Structure 1
Amino acid sequence: SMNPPPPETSNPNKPKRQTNQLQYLLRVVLKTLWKHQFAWPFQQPVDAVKLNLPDYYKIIKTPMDMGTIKKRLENNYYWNAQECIQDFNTMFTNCYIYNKPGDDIVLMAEALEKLFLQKINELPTEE
């Protein structure tokens, strides 16, 4: 059994910025989700070997997780907030695509996603 390489978190030739919106995504959005009781399955890439999910990376072709997003934010990987918001949405969508309604992991994702939506509703206007 084999995991793919993780998503990219470093690329010196990708242009990047540290906008007030990106700072909010780290300080408010990531921090809020990371500390939640249901964060743990989302704090690193899905390990299809350890979890015995040999079909996971056949079904999910754009993997994403908050460990990756945390590294991207800490490393100032992004150009804009939309890039980062897309990563959170990819993470949630992947979970809904792979799993069944009512599974524990789906309930966990839905709780995180409610908080995510509440926090990005107050994304600040760009400085």
Structure 2
Amino acid sequence: SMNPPPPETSNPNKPKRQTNQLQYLLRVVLKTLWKHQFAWPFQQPVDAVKLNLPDYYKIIKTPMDMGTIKKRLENNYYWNAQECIQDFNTMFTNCYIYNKPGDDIVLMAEALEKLFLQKINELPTEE
């Protein structure tokens, strides 16, 4: 069995910006989620081979994870905050699609999503 290539994290042709909202997304939002007790299933692309989840990438066609988001932020990949917020939302949605109601990992994703949304409320106004 085989994993797909990971999502791209660098593209020399893709425009980018440094903004106060993107800085907040790295320094506060990503940092807070990354340090949470429930971060570990989300800190890297799903390794479907090692985890013996051969159906994962049959079901999930837009994979996303916090490892990839962290690299996109640090590599100066993004033009805007909405791209990064979308990546977090894809990560949560994927978890709800692949797994079932009440599953361990769904409960974890729900707790991280609640925390994410709390931090997004304090997203600074753009300068």
The two structures share one fold, judged by TM-score above 0.5: yes
Q: CA deviation at 1:14?
A: 0.3
Q: For 1:101 and 1:32, locate their aligned partners in 2 and report how far apart those are by CA, in whole Å.
A: 25
Q: CA deviation at 1:21?
A: 0.3
SS of the residue aligned with 2:6?
A: coil
Q: For 2:97 and 2:18, locate their aligned partners in 1 and report how far apart those are by CA, in whole Å.
A: 32
Q: For 1:126 and 1:57, locate their aligned partners in 2 and report how far apart those are by CA, in whole Å.
A: 36
- State the 4+ residue runs in structure 1 displaced beyond 6 angstroms: none
Q: For 1:51 and 1:33, locate their aligned partners in 2 and report how far apart those are by CA, in whole Å.
A: 22
Q: CA deviation at 1:123?
A: 0.8
Q: For 2:7 and 2:61, locate their aligned partners in 1 and report how far apart those are by CA, in whole Å.
A: 11
Q: CA deviation at 1:121?
A: 1.1
Q: For 2:81 and 2:57, locate their aligned partners in 1 and report how far apart those are by CA, in whole Å.
A: 27
Q: CA deviation at 1:31?
A: 0.2
SS of the residue aligned with 1:49?
A: helix
Q: Which runs of 5+ in 2 are unaligned?
A: none
SS of the residue aligned with 1:125?
A: coil
Q: For 2:125 and 2:60, locate their aligned partners in 1 and report how far apart those are by CA, in whole Å.
A: 33
2:119 aligns with: 119
Q: CA deviation at 1:122?
A: 1.3
> What whole-Å deviation, never above 9, does each CA across 1:19-78 have from its counterpart, x for those lacking one?
000000000100000000000000000010011111110110000000000000001100
Q: For 1:11 and 1:98, locate their aligned partners in 2 and report how far apart those are by CA, in whole Å.
A: 28
1:89 aligns with: 89
1:33 aligns with: 33
Q: For 1:97 and 1:23, locate their aligned partners in 2 and report how far apart those are by CA, in whole Å.
A: 30
Is 1:43–2:38 an aligned residue pair?
no
Q: For 1:47 and 1:103, locate their aligned partners in 2 and report how far apart those are by CA, in whole Å.
A: 19
The count of residues paired between Structure 1 and Structure 2 equals: 127
Q: For 2:68 and 2:99, locate their aligned partners in 1 and report how far apart those are by CA, in whole Å.
A: 21
Q: CA deviation at 1:126?
A: 0.5
